[PDB]
Design a protein around this ligand. Structure first.
Ligand code: POV
Ligand code: POV
Ligand code: POV
Ligand code: CLR
Ligand code: 2J9
Ligand code: 2J9
Ligand code: 2J9
Ligand code: 2J9
Ligand code: NAG
Lengths: 446, 446, 446, 446
């Protein structure tokens, strides 16, 4: 029938926390958190009766050097007003001089919080990138230009008018093949490297086709080479994953809680990587050292802000917000711990207790309960450097647009020929219906 | 001041090891390492003197299960024949109930050692990789697609029905050279940049040949550019990435030291992933359970294998050798700690001391000394080996597959004709040997 | 201990500057910088106290040439109204004959500031760059070469003399389709990957068409690959690289502060390079001689210009701005030094002191503090802009040049034929207008 | 008529040095060096008479901490046995406590010495690199393989034997064009992307040509892509130019003089770059810290040795040996100086003198005299990333080899046809001479 114990906690999340319910009448039934699950299991295997009681200051603990005294939870331990400190109260060199701890039950770390890479969004015309929109207009102007020149040269040049029926010699007919329609077909035929028939014959037309070929060879070998340059630097581009990789940047900005434990590390740092990281912060001590963790989250979502905090509070917000991530490893290495008054007969019986809960694996079950929650749809890390339908893609759009464009021209040829010969003969339909049957007659004659 | 301290320590890799020098007589300088460098600052802040001994029955410590009867270092700390036991000694619930520990000075867990992804077996069909397998299906649906629309328009257009036989004008003959067979041949011919022997007249089927040419120019330039992106910046990856990925597969096989801290972890575990992993090792004992750490690396380094040791021992071996890396995060969490006999006041003194050295970062500065090294910086400079049969051997397979497909068609064409030669009032079997002599007639006439 | 020391100092960029904060009243904290950070370790080793004043007539110091009558800081050190004069004061023969100096704590010389090579005007004929201009000459000597050897073998081979007119066999007709004109056309046709309408039979001219095809496949694949190498990793360079390179040119124009240490250097020089450079500036005074340092950067940053100041002032400006760099090595060599009145024993004390701070590297640690910064790390990540008229505008020039060349040939072919129409017993002038009506006859017959 | 002065020097080069001549009888006419040119000009403008006298120890100066005394030149200054120290005696913190200096007359620096990049030597067949020598054998085996298959299929397939004289209908002849000679010409014609006539007609031969086209498209797009990978990483490869860039390496090894002033800098270094540089040296204190400068030069020429010394002695050996260079800037910053006894009336009159020689520019003339010598043919920094005749080059060898091979085949066709018809007719020569005339008859008939 010993005295019940009096623990002092602080309202952090997923740490101790009011039970979300109506009908208010509660003793120790107010609080519902990670540590209240921890205080329950430590009470079972040691056999004591706790009585939770919040801290009055609302602070962890610090030493006002002017007064030379303490505040917060750690003052309640010194004056023996409480005797347990089940809390996120970390382990520092200044605290252990005054009060006594147990062994750690969670491992902290400093790590970088930052927005996920949102995506690419190439737009499904990305094949059209490696030349300027001036060049794609000028090439199409050149192919209409050179075709209109080649039609004019093939009229005037007398060596072009050769003899048709080349297999039937000794007649009197001449015919050049470069009409207006075929002259575009030589230009388009040479532009897409496929060649054509009706090659130029006279030397005045050999020069035009001889120099248009050299125009196509430089364009297509430039489009192939430049598209290799886009796809090389995209795979060669890597997202940042370090503190040192984020140290070299200047466009992406740092951040911390004002006069917290994170700022304390960088002023006392001696690493050359971390030394310049304090130099960028102290240069900008108006816009990145914001106030606290709650304002540090909001600045990441609305900027290029790369806030730094402890590794636990990263792992709770990345599970509750799938926009965010945990770039980088662990900078520092700290730990939590149940605190006790100086020289008390409980720093051992909790040290025994925390290890026994570790052997049975309960601390990992208590962490996966509270820190995972409403399981994220996360994965979606496609990033596949292989041309899908997000990229090239739209070449099938202009392909299908061309084939539909052809069918309206095919109706145009079908109507124009059917109304041409019908002005010589039978009126409209008995000329048109017999052409559809002559089409539908599968025999290769008529 | 009083008499010196007998620091009982075991000898391992980079904590305590002999000097490699001359004059083999030294005494009290016979051991050096990280753990020895820890003691040099331990005697600086807290004043004491050394008599570093090595344990005569060198082990860490365990039960007897028949006499209780501890071994290793911690057997010496009970009988007070020793002192502070600064070593790679791990905090465990069984050990803490007997002697004492300080608060930990190094964190560690269980993680996975595995061969680094090499990239010298990419698969024999590696050339498909620059395009997504949707697009390889889509260009066949395009090439079979456009050829069918080419066949419809070529019969629908009246200007395609042209006059053959230019040696003989003024006839009734008419050809429509695009069959169903030739229409696929124009599409396949333009797809492979080789042209064809026929070509569209009659403008409504010029657009189809026009827009299909521009389709093939973008695809082949996209295939050439993206294949140039692969051979410039290679990006290899591991098959398995976490313990959950390694739990599912059975191609790679697992590994753990028998009767060690790792094997006893999975026997006591109750996670559904790890209980599957212990169900593996219990079945295949004496084949995957190594008997020592050094034999365990050789199982990775020779065979296809995965190994599970403590994370600090991984972080040294992966700096020495470049063949192998660490896969995944830390599974468990335990700590190394300074041993101390039960009730000695040096426990609380070193606990203050280790937190002091943490604040300047002397622990981190010493860990950089005794785990860094060569660094394996050869993940650069991209040697760019020549293409060979390891990479593009797949096209020699699909070349021979086409020719074997061709002979089955060539027999099918030979047997189809003799059926219609049997339609001309002959024997089907006799007319086969008649035509086979005509192939072997070998003259180029009739 | 005695009274304090009146440290007379001028105010400049990053040596001594005001604080940017609130509470404008401070006193003895009103100045901070590199040179102020030097004094903090100067009072640490050698004990003294501060009364930092600023010089009322702020200059460094020079003659009067009419009254002698020094100015600046060193006028105060003569009359003993001052003390140690730690500042950007330079050791010079005229100054050392009057007061004293310590041994120098910073080395510096005269070097050249200039615009960074940008790379946004590569030249309009930039596509010639992947091949050497020997090879562009060599493929024309090959294409004119192989076509001539094609013409010889085609007449030398009896199997090329084949039978034309396949509609009519059993004749005496024979063609040799390779003329001199067609032989160049086959070479140009195979060079531009377009094929031709004629093709060799007769095996001895198949090898020529065989080996020329393999010649063109290697060249065009080499042009495409090397052009892809340029657009991936750009490598810009400066026009001038040293003072000797800048001495020869007259396109870029020089620059120096009037009546400064730089302008007085070149007037006294006797090196043949620099005497040419002073012959430039004496001719073009009031156009290239700036009147202040800050106006001198603006001449570089706006116009095409080169500037010559001290090397330390360059090394700060090039860290702040990214538009401009340093070109070449140091020309002169001078030093900064702590001033001291004539005969004061503080000269030899600081001389010991500066050598002390050099040994730990406190000078180098402070110089990293007050000259580094943003660093301009943007010489990475290779934005890979699209090809445009700045880069491949040259082929539109050589396209239009070919067509204007074509019309002069087309007139030459039209006038050549009417000469032989005048050979058929007609007027040369009258038969021209007869044939010009036949082009304008516009019917496709006779 | 004051006393003549007694200077003590040491036999360094280009410092004081015996005059290379016979007929030995010399006073102060022995020595002939940089400093003897310096001692001459200081004697003129101050008006004293020197008397040179070498040091007896042969050492610069050092403090044996066991004895607590000095040696070398600096002991001769303390005991007043000499009174000048015109030498390469540097300025250190330990020397200036005991003796007094003048201002520096030369600026040292620590810099890295290393072998020049010897070259590339691609071998002029470098186009043949991006495929393995197995692939270039297998492609040539495939083109002989597929051609021999296509000849066999075109014999058996009855749809291949179409009608010749296609312009002359209604005859009875059949003729397939796929002979043995044309079947190779289809394979070679499709291999180099140029196409051909005599396209396959029956579906059994459409499959062979349909799948050989896909074989060529993968090969040529692989050869283009892989050659881009070679030429990208060659431009992306950069030679080392830093100390930090050489810090990351492990294949290229460091080096220093045993217990010299260079080793003194790295043990007292605090830069994280330089700290690991001492870690690599102290790990290998048997093979890189060789003995001295004379053995340090020989190790660079015969290894991958990257020796470190002062900046002056680099600049003398790189002018006398064009194999070597001065990679990197200046690590440290030191200086030389005329030394004097402690508190002597000459540390000022030399300080005045050295500046007056600096204003007239004589120290730069005295440096360009002795440190340049037998002016190097240096420049040869072509390194032009543009395909010259060192690269591709050899495609002109196989081009010229093919054209010479053709002419021996052309004689073979000319002899075989001339001896074929002559067995029907006229004996040998009057058939052969009339074919040469029929060749030489320029008319296109016969
Ligand atoms: C860069 C390189 C590009 C260029 C490529 C260069 C590469 C060069 C590589 C090689 C070049 C070799 C040239 C070929 C020489 C032959 C000559 C010829 O063709 O004409 C001849 C046709 O003879 C024939 O070849 C066709 C025969 C028709 C039917 C035969 C059926 C075979 C049976 C199926 C077998 C199935 C059994 C096996 C299956 C398991 C006729 O003309 P002739 O010669 O005047 O007449 C000779 C008459 N005599 C023969 C009686 C004397
Ligand atoms: C794969 C295709 C193979 C075929 C090859 C055929 C092309 C080979 C022919 C010629 C190339 C050889 C000349 C290049 C020499 C250096 C360039 C130069 O100095 O440019 C200068 C002159 O500006 C120009 O006028 C450009 C150079 C001539 C190109 C104009 C003719 C194009 C060919 C028309 C017919 C084509 C069709 C012909 C066949 C039907 C200025 O430019 P830049 O910015 O100062 O350049 C820097 C170079 N530099 C550092 C040395 C100064
Ligand atoms: C992806 C896309 C690829 C495909 C490309 C698609 C792109 C499409 C773009 C364009 C397509 C447009 C088609 C053209 C329509 C014409 C029809 C035709 O050709 O036949 C006609 C030939 O008429 C001629 O055009 C040739 C006449 C020859 C002599 C004329 C010389 C001109 C004088 C020099 C001038 C110098 C002065 C200026 C100098 C500064 C005849 O056939 P018909 O029509 O039955 O008869 C009509 C008779 N009527 C006219 C009396 C009614
Ligand atoms: C579909 C709408 C826009 C109408 C298009 C009309 C086009 C397709 C028609 C109208 C007149 C036609 C031309 C009339 C006569 C000839 C001469 C013949 O020897 C070849 C075809 C050719 C050259 C035709 C080509 C197609 C043509 C240009
Ligand atoms: O409170 S501690 O025992 N002392 C400091 N350490 C170390 C990083 C070594 C750590 C690291 C992680 C912890 F959880 C606790 C501690
Ligand atoms: O042996 S401990 O003091 N107690 C158990 N824990 C925890 C896993 C929470 C840890 C975690 C890391 C350590 F370094 C030590 C310990
Ligand atoms: O003011 S000095 O002591 N005298 C002149 N010298 C020398 C050029 C040798 C130098 C060179 C660099 C300095 F920093 C100082 C001096
Ligand atoms: O003998 S010193 O005046 N003291 C040290 N300094 C340096 C600040 C680097 C230098 C640098 C170059 C010198 F030539 C002399 C000196
Ligand atoms: C340069 O030539 C020397 C002399 O044999 C040779 O040892 C060295 O390897 C060459 N350099 C390179 C980079 O191959």
């Amino acid at each position: 029938s010993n005295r019940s114990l009096i623990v002092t906690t602080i309202l952090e999340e997923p740490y101790v926390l009011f039970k979300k319910s109506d009908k208010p009448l509660y003793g120790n039934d107010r609080f519902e958190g990670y540590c209240i699950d921890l205080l329950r299991e430590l009470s079972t295997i040691l056999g004591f009766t706790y009585e939770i009681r919040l801290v009055e200051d609302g602070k962890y603990g610090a030493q006002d050097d002017v007064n030379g005294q303490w505040n917060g939870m750690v003052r309640e331990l010194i004056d023996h007003k409480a005797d347990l400190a089940v809390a996120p109260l970390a382990i520092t060199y200044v605290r252990e001089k005054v009060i006594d701890f147990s062994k750690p039950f969670m491992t902290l770390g400093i790590s970088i919080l930052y927005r996920k890479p949102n995506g690419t969004n190439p737009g499904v015309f990305s094949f059209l990138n490696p030349l300027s929109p001036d060049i794609w207009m000028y090439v199409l102007l050149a192919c209409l230009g050179v075709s209109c020149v080649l039609f004019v040269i093939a009229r005037f040049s007398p060596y072009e008018w050769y003899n048709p029926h080349p297999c039937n010699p000794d007649s009197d007919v001449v015919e050049n093949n470069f009409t207006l329609l075929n002259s575009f077909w030589f230009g388009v035929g040479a532009l897409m490297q496929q060649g054509s028939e009706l090659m130029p014959k006279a030397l005045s037309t050999r020069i035009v086709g001889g120099i248009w070929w050299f125009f196509t060879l430089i364009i297509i070998s430039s489009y192939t080479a430049n598209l290799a340059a886009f796809l090389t630097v995209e795979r060669m581009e890597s997202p940042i994953d370090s503190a040192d990789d984020l140290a070299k940047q200047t466009k992406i900005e740092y951040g911390a809680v004002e006069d917290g434990a994170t700022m304390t590390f960088f002023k006392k740092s001696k690493i050359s990587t971390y030394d310049k990281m304090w130099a960028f912060m102290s240069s900008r001590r108006q816009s990145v050292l914001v106030k606290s963790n709650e304002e540090g989250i909001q600045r990441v979502l609305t900027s290029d802000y790369a806030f730094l905090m402890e590794s636990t509070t990263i792992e709770f917000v990345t599970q509750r917000n799938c926009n965010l991530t945990q770039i980088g490893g662990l900078i520092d290495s700290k730990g939590y711990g149940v605190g006790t008054p100086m020289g008390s007969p409980y720093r051992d019986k909790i040290t025994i207790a925390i290890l026994q809960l570790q052997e049975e694996g309960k601390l990992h079950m208590m962490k996966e309960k509270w820190w995972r929650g409403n399981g994220c749809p996360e994965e979606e890390s496609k990033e596949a450097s292989a041309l899908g339908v997000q990229n090239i893609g739209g070449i099938f759009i202009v392909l299908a647009a061309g084939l539909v464009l052809s069918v309206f021209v095919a109706v145009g040829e079908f109507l124009y020929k059917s109304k041409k010969n019908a002005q010589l003969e039978k009126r409209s339909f008995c000329s048109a219906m017999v052409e559809e049957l002559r089409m539908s007659l599968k025999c290769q004659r008529r």
